[PDB]
Amino acid sequence: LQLRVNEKLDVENILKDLDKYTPKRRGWTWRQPAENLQMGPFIYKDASTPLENSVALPSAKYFGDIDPQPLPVITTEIASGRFEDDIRRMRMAAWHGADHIMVIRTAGQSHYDGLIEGTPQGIGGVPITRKQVRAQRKALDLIEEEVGRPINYHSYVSGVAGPDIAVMFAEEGVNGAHQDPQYNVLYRNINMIRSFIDACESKTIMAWADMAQIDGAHNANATAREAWKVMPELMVQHALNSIFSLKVGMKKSNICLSTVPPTAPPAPSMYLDLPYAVALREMFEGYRMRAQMNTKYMEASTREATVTHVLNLLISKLTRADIQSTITPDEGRNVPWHIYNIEACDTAKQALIGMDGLMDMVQLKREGVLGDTVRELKERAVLFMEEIIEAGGYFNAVEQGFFVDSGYYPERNGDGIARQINGGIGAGTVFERDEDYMAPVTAHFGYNNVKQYDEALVSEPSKLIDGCTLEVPEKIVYIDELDENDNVNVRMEETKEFRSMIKPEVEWQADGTVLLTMFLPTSKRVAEFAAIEFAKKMNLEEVEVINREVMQEAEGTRIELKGRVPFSIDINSLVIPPILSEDEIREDIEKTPLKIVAATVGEDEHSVGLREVIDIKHGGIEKYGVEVHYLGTSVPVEKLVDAAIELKADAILASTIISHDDIHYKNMKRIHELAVEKGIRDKIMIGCGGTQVTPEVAVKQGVDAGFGRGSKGIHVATFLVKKRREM
Amino acid sequence: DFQQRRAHLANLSDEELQTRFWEMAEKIVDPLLDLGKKNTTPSIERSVLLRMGFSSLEAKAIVDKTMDRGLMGKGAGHIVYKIAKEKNISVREAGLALSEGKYWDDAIQ
Ligand code: B12
Ligand SMILES: C[C@H]1O[C@@H](n2cnc3c(N)ncnc32)[C@H](O)[C@H]1O
Ligand SMILES: *Cc1c(COP(=O)(O)O)cnc(C)c1O
């Protein structure tokens, strides 16, 4: 129900009744192609069906405020520790075109040996429980019916509790998940046996729910000493996980590779990534690509990150990408803030729309150098396979340290993470199934003797108990909370207040954080500390320098800073005061013509001022169709009023620069009198300007308007079409 | 070194190379699919129970007692079930009950 595009999101109301909540939709959804689409004045080649409500890129104001949507599903990461502030960020994310919410889990939830209940405050991620998945999956259900396009909720099914979370995800309509047996082994040191048997059950559940599945290979670039050498390991890992998911029972169209452009500038990044991207696309035809933006080789400059992402985005365009996960341009600087999440989304929208139709104009030179490197990668991937095999399959190679080796395979340095096949977390919890083993549930991978009870049920083991929780949502137990301190209700109270007081925030409600940017004419170490002082004297709390860039070792240093503003403000106190566009102005001088006489008057030779608000270059009033009879400089005030009637003009525009002895205010009073005297003061606009003119002082001379330092044709044309109307 | 290890692939067509790739894949994982078919783990069994309508809490009670009984092999949801039909009560009752020592002797027979 509801959600008005102008009423904030009702978090407290949403958390109301998380026991009666069941999901509208299920499984994954792609974007619907909108072939040859007409938006604003343009035709789009690679666009998807538009949103019914959104925020267009700022530059669209010049185009009718159109917001084209690209073909790839665009992903935004979202987790702060409190899933409540994160719902507001999701509504934000949606309007800016994102349709894939990915939710990271509190650090190491992977090691949790079971679900957890309720909604604790998490650490560098949201903790994943049922209350929280229902709250977010319920909010997205409004937000989605709002922007007018389905949104995929997405998370992680990893570590010793694989099958639980997966099961919970299916009960509660999560649309996709990361899941890779090997993330578990290689990176979380979880027993490789335990782990690979967990993933069988996991994936089976997930195939049952039509969920999208993303793998863990990107984590390879993270650990690589030099990412551009980890290519053979990458294809291999991708391939094991793909083939594994395929034989469990998932659909190739539901299996996604998680591929990241290897390197970043000053690296010749395009020339190193394009072969890998192309080889990867060749080798895994029929599978989905989820393109992720680089995060390894990334520093503190939002700009530097943003530019690299555009290049990353290019690779996707010159190849393929069914999903396009974005990275917050601030990732290397701090925890993603609301704004930088919107930045990433607008960037990808901006770049993909920008290169709409590109592959109609450009192609890859698939022979030549490109085609050769592609071969070299494939051959190395293949050799790597055989090395694995000729050592006795996966479990062995891992023990013998083939993975996370810092070399370019064949090359092996002997520093990969080596796991014990008898070791790791949960070693010795694998139990041999018995001939009489049984499970009366749906989506069970392993060997299951339902036959010793009823043949007719082999394919429907759940009949044994009249439906498990996949058939019968009503059999699901919903635990609300286990802790009565660390919980969402307690966290709502902490900030109950702000819900007419107002303060800045970056991630959590009312955290009073703001970004401060300056430049200081000194060395880097010093300017760092100098900027702290400035920062404090502006009453900032908990100050941190979050980025130093050198300009020149001596000349200066750019500094970003976050700091907390230790106070609120009130709307109800704000002093808020309740203009014609260039086109109205033009449409007015269009229908009724406007003739002007303009001159620098007196003995004044300063001509540039008046030429400036007249000449078309800087938006002077030639721009709008005004007819201007320039008399030149040093024109006697009589001679100007004479010309005005000679040429049956509508306005005199006199300029007056020299201002010694008030000569500029006098020259005006004399224009007004020469005008009154000659019986035309009432049917002619007299307007004047000059560096030393104060509008109001000039109006007291008897001229309809004055113009000072920094005026432009727009102001002059405006005054001319407005004042004219009066008369 | 790589110049020699790549010799026996040098002849393969780009698509034979591809073929070779994916069958070595299938060859690497099948043994893993097997382990998966004939074994069980604690997390797997919790998830059967979760499916049978237990909480994550209750479920790590049944499973944690089921390991102390060497009963894992039979499947924690098969115990719950045959104990259910034996004392002819509900699934949620025989289960609720197994969470605190009740009906484990009967079970073991
Ligand atoms: C370059 C210059 C000259 C040039 C001008 C060349 C030319 N063709 O214009 C020449 C012409 C080289 C010159 C001459 C002199 N000038 Co001189 N000139 C300057 C200087 C540096 C340029 C200012 C300027 O051009 N502004 C740039 C324009 C774009 O801005 P603007 O004039 O302010 O116009 C803006 C607004 O006024 C407004 N506007 C202006 N008029 C109108 C009219 C209308 C209808 C509207 C809507 C808006 C509008 O729109 C413009 C913004 O887009 C200034 C110093 C200064 N920094 O102001 C003096 C300065 C104004 N001139 C000065 C002096 C003293 C002189 C001389 C008397 C000295 C001398 N050389 O012997 C001579 C005599 C001039 C004469 N014979 O009449 C003094 C001012 C004296 C005074 N207080 O009265 C100044 C301030 C320099 C100084 N500090 O001494 N100089
Ligand atoms: C320290 C933590 O353990 C969990 N937790 C698990 N069981 C309980 C319980 N019976 N009471 C309170 N918290 C519990 C939390 O929800 C958590 O934050
Ligand atoms: C923009 C531009 C200028 C601007 O300088 P002005 O002296 O103010 O006219 C000059 N020449 C060219 C060719 C330009 O494009």
Coordinates of C-alpha atoms in Angstrom, one line a residue, chain A residues 102-392:
Chain A
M102 CA 23.2 -6.6 -3.1
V103 CA 23.6 -6.9 0.6
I104 CA 26.9 -7.8 2.2
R105 CA 26.9 -9.6 5.6
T106 CA 28.5 -8.5 8.8
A107 CA 32.2 -9.5 8.7
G108 CA 32.6 -13.2 9.1
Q109 CA 28.9 -14.2 9.2
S110 CA 30.3 -17.0 7.1
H111 CA 31.7 -18.5 10.2
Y112 CA 28.4 -18.5 12.0
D113 CA 27.3 -22.2 12.2
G114 CA 23.6 -21.6 11.8
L115 CA 21.1 -18.8 11.2
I116 CA 20.9 -16.2 13.8
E117 CA 17.7 -14.5 14.7
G118 CA 16.5 -11.0 15.1
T119 CA 18.4 -7.9 14.0
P120 CA 21.7 -7.1 15.8
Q121 CA 23.9 -4.2 14.8
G122 CA 26.5 -5.6 12.4
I123 CA 30.1 -4.9 11.6
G124 CA 31.1 -3.7 8.1
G125 CA 27.9 -5.4 6.8
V126 CA 24.3 -6.2 7.6
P127 CA 23.8 -9.4 9.7
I128 CA 21.5 -11.8 7.8
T129 CA 18.5 -13.1 9.6
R130 CA 14.8 -13.6 8.8
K131 CA 13.4 -10.5 10.4
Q132 CA 15.9 -8.5 8.3
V133 CA 15.3 -10.3 5.0
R134 CA 11.5 -9.8 5.4
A135 CA 11.9 -6.1 6.2
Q136 CA 14.1 -5.4 3.2
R137 CA 12.2 -7.8 0.8
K138 CA 9.0 -6.0 2.0
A139 CA 10.4 -2.5 1.4
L140 CA 11.7 -3.3 -2.0
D141 CA 8.1 -4.4 -2.7
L142 CA 6.9 -0.9 -2.3
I143 CA 9.9 0.8 -3.8
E144 CA 9.5 -1.5 -6.8
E145 CA 5.7 -0.9 -7.3
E146 CA 6.8 2.8 -7.0
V147 CA 9.5 3.1 -9.7
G148 CA 7.5 0.7 -11.8
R149 CA 9.9 -2.1 -12.5
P150 CA 10.8 -5.3 -10.5
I151 CA 13.9 -5.2 -8.2
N152 CA 16.1 -8.2 -7.4
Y153 CA 17.1 -8.7 -3.8
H154 CA 20.4 -10.4 -3.4
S155 CA 22.8 -11.8 -0.8
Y156 CA 25.3 -14.4 0.3
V157 CA 25.0 -18.1 1.0
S158 CA 28.4 -18.9 2.4
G159 CA 30.5 -20.7 5.0
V160 CA 29.5 -23.4 7.4
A161 CA 25.8 -22.5 7.3
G162 CA 25.2 -22.8 3.5
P163 CA 22.0 -24.8 3.4
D164 CA 20.3 -22.9 6.2
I165 CA 20.6 -19.4 4.7
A166 CA 19.8 -20.9 1.3
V167 CA 16.7 -22.4 2.7
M168 CA 15.8 -19.2 4.4
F169 CA 16.4 -17.3 1.2
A170 CA 14.0 -19.6 -0.7
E171 CA 11.3 -19.3 2.0
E172 CA 11.6 -15.5 1.9
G173 CA 12.0 -14.8 -1.8
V174 CA 15.6 -13.7 -2.2
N175 CA 16.2 -13.4 -6.0
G176 CA 19.9 -14.3 -6.2
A177 CA 22.9 -15.2 -4.1
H178 CA 26.6 -15.6 -4.2
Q179 CA 27.6 -19.2 -3.7
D180 CA 31.0 -20.8 -4.4
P181 CA 32.3 -23.9 -2.6
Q182 CA 35.8 -22.5 -3.1
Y183 CA 35.4 -19.1 -1.6
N184 CA 34.8 -21.3 1.5
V185 CA 37.9 -23.4 1.2
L186 CA 40.6 -21.1 -0.2
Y187 CA 39.6 -17.9 1.6
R188 CA 37.7 -18.7 4.8
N189 CA 39.7 -21.9 5.5
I190 CA 36.6 -24.1 5.8
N191 CA 37.2 -27.8 5.5
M192 CA 37.1 -28.6 1.8
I193 CA 35.0 -31.8 2.3
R194 CA 32.4 -30.3 4.6
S195 CA 32.3 -27.4 2.2
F196 CA 31.8 -29.1 -1.1
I197 CA 29.0 -31.2 0.4
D198 CA 27.3 -28.1 1.7
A199 CA 27.2 -26.5 -1.7
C200 CA 25.4 -29.5 -3.2
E201 CA 22.4 -29.0 -0.9
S202 CA 22.7 -25.2 -1.2
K203 CA 22.6 -25.1 -5.0
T204 CA 19.8 -27.6 -5.2
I205 CA 17.6 -25.4 -2.9
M206 CA 18.5 -22.4 -5.1
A207 CA 17.7 -24.1 -8.4
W208 CA 14.4 -24.9 -6.8
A209 CA 13.7 -21.2 -6.2
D210 CA 14.7 -20.1 -9.7
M211 CA 17.5 -18.0 -8.1
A212 CA 20.4 -16.4 -9.9
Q213 CA 23.7 -17.6 -8.8
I214 CA 26.9 -15.5 -8.8
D215 CA 30.3 -17.1 -8.1
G216 CA 33.4 -16.0 -6.1
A217 CA 36.2 -15.7 -8.6
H218 CA 36.5 -11.9 -8.3
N219 CA 38.0 -12.6 -4.9
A220 CA 41.0 -13.8 -6.9
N221 CA 41.9 -10.3 -8.1
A222 CA 41.8 -9.3 -4.4
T223 CA 44.5 -11.6 -3.3
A224 CA 46.6 -11.5 -6.4
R225 CA 50.0 -9.8 -5.9
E226 CA 49.7 -8.7 -9.6
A227 CA 46.2 -9.2 -10.9
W228 CA 47.3 -9.4 -14.5
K229 CA 48.9 -12.8 -13.9
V230 CA 46.0 -14.5 -12.1
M231 CA 44.2 -15.1 -15.4
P232 CA 44.6 -18.9 -15.7
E233 CA 43.5 -19.3 -12.1
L234 CA 40.5 -17.2 -12.8
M235 CA 39.1 -19.1 -15.8
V236 CA 39.7 -22.3 -14.0
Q237 CA 37.8 -21.3 -10.8
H238 CA 35.0 -19.9 -12.9
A239 CA 34.8 -23.2 -14.8
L240 CA 34.7 -25.4 -11.8
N241 CA 31.9 -23.5 -10.2
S242 CA 30.0 -23.3 -13.5
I243 CA 30.2 -27.0 -14.2
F244 CA 29.5 -27.9 -10.5
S245 CA 26.3 -25.7 -10.5
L246 CA 25.3 -27.2 -13.9
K247 CA 25.3 -30.8 -12.7
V248 CA 23.5 -30.0 -9.5
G249 CA 20.6 -28.8 -11.7
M250 CA 20.8 -25.0 -12.3
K251 CA 20.1 -23.4 -15.6
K252 CA 23.0 -21.8 -17.6
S253 CA 20.8 -18.7 -17.8
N254 CA 20.8 -18.7 -14.0
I255 CA 24.6 -19.2 -13.6
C256 CA 26.7 -16.1 -13.7
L257 CA 30.4 -15.6 -13.8
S258 CA 31.7 -12.8 -11.6
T259 CA 34.3 -11.2 -13.7
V260 CA 36.4 -8.2 -13.0
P261 CA 38.7 -6.3 -15.4
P262 CA 42.1 -7.3 -13.9
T263 CA 44.0 -4.1 -13.7
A264 CA 43.8 -0.3 -13.7
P265 CA 45.6 2.8 -15.1
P266 CA 48.7 3.7 -15.2
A267 CA 48.5 0.1 -16.2
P268 CA 47.6 -0.2 -19.9
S269 CA 44.3 -1.5 -18.6
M270 CA 42.2 -1.8 -21.7
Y271 CA 45.1 -3.6 -23.5
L272 CA 45.4 -6.1 -20.7
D273 CA 41.7 -6.7 -19.9
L274 CA 40.2 -6.9 -23.3
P275 CA 41.8 -10.2 -24.2
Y276 CA 40.8 -11.8 -20.8
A277 CA 37.2 -10.4 -21.2
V278 CA 37.0 -11.8 -24.8
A279 CA 38.6 -15.2 -23.9
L280 CA 36.2 -15.5 -21.0
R281 CA 33.2 -14.7 -23.2
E282 CA 34.4 -17.3 -25.8
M283 CA 35.0 -20.1 -23.3
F284 CA 31.8 -19.7 -21.4
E285 CA 29.3 -19.2 -24.2
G286 CA 25.7 -19.6 -23.0
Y287 CA 26.5 -18.5 -19.4
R288 CA 25.8 -15.1 -17.9
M289 CA 28.4 -12.5 -17.2
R290 CA 28.2 -10.3 -14.1
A291 CA 30.7 -7.5 -14.7
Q292 CA 32.1 -6.1 -11.5
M293 CA 34.1 -2.9 -11.3
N294 CA 37.7 -2.9 -10.1
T295 CA 38.3 -2.5 -6.3
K296 CA 41.8 -3.8 -5.8
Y297 CA 43.9 -1.1 -7.5
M298 CA 41.9 1.7 -6.1
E299 CA 42.8 4.7 -4.0
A300 CA 41.3 7.7 -2.3
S301 CA 40.2 9.8 -5.3
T302 CA 36.5 9.6 -6.1
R303 CA 37.5 11.0 -9.5
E304 CA 40.3 8.5 -10.1
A305 CA 37.8 5.7 -9.2
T306 CA 35.1 7.1 -11.4
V307 CA 37.3 7.4 -14.4
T308 CA 38.6 3.8 -14.0
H309 CA 35.0 2.6 -13.7
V310 CA 34.2 4.2 -17.0
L311 CA 37.0 2.2 -18.7
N312 CA 35.7 -0.9 -16.9
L313 CA 32.3 0.0 -18.2
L314 CA 33.7 0.2 -21.7
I315 CA 35.1 -3.4 -21.6
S316 CA 31.6 -4.6 -20.8
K317 CA 30.2 -2.7 -23.8
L318 CA 32.9 -4.0 -26.2
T319 CA 31.9 -7.4 -25.0
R320 CA 29.0 -8.6 -22.9
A321 CA 27.4 -8.0 -19.5
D322 CA 24.0 -9.2 -18.4
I323 CA 24.7 -7.8 -15.0
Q324 CA 26.8 -4.8 -14.3
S325 CA 27.7 -4.3 -10.6
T326 CA 28.9 -0.9 -9.8
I327 CA 31.4 0.2 -7.2
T328 CA 31.0 3.2 -5.0
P329 CA 33.6 5.8 -6.1
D330 CA 34.4 6.3 -2.4
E331 CA 35.1 2.6 -1.6
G332 CA 38.8 3.3 -1.2
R333 CA 38.1 6.3 1.1
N334 CA 35.6 5.0 3.6
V335 CA 32.3 3.0 4.2
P336 CA 30.0 3.7 1.2
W337 CA 27.9 6.8 2.0
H338 CA 24.4 7.3 0.6
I339 CA 25.5 9.8 -2.0
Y340 CA 28.4 7.8 -3.5
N341 CA 26.0 4.9 -4.0
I342 CA 23.9 7.2 -6.1
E343 CA 27.0 8.4 -7.9
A344 CA 27.9 4.9 -9.0
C345 CA 24.4 4.2 -10.3
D346 CA 24.2 7.5 -12.2
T347 CA 27.7 6.9 -13.6
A348 CA 26.9 3.5 -15.0
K349 CA 23.6 4.8 -16.4
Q350 CA 25.5 7.7 -17.8
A351 CA 28.3 5.6 -19.5
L352 CA 26.1 2.9 -20.9
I353 CA 23.6 5.4 -22.3
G354 CA 26.5 7.4 -23.6
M355 CA 27.8 4.4 -25.6
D356 CA 24.4 3.4 -26.7
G357 CA 24.6 1.9 -30.2
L358 CA 28.5 1.7 -30.0
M359 CA 28.8 -1.9 -31.3
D360 CA 27.1 -0.8 -34.5
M361 CA 30.1 1.4 -35.1
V362 CA 33.0 -0.5 -33.7
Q363 CA 34.2 -4.1 -33.7
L364 CA 37.1 -6.1 -32.2
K365 CA 40.0 -7.0 -34.4
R366 CA 39.6 -10.6 -33.3
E367 CA 42.6 -11.6 -35.4
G368 CA 45.9 -9.7 -34.9
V369 CA 47.3 -9.3 -31.5
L370 CA 44.0 -9.6 -29.7
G371 CA 43.3 -13.0 -31.2
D372 CA 46.7 -14.2 -30.2
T373 CA 46.7 -13.3 -26.5
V374 CA 43.2 -14.9 -26.4
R375 CA 44.8 -18.2 -27.5
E376 CA 47.6 -17.9 -25.0
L377 CA 45.1 -17.5 -22.1
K378 CA 43.0 -20.5 -23.2
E379 CA 46.1 -22.7 -23.5
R380 CA 47.2 -21.6 -20.0
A381 CA 43.8 -22.3 -18.5
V382 CA 43.9 -25.7 -20.2
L383 CA 47.4 -26.5 -19.0
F384 CA 46.3 -25.5 -15.4
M385 CA 43.4 -27.9 -15.6
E386 CA 45.7 -30.8 -16.5
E387 CA 48.2 -29.9 -13.7
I388 CA 45.2 -30.2 -11.3
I389 CA 44.2 -33.5 -12.8
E390 CA 47.7 -35.0 -13.0
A391 CA 47.9 -34.4 -9.2
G392 CA 44.6 -36.1 -8.4

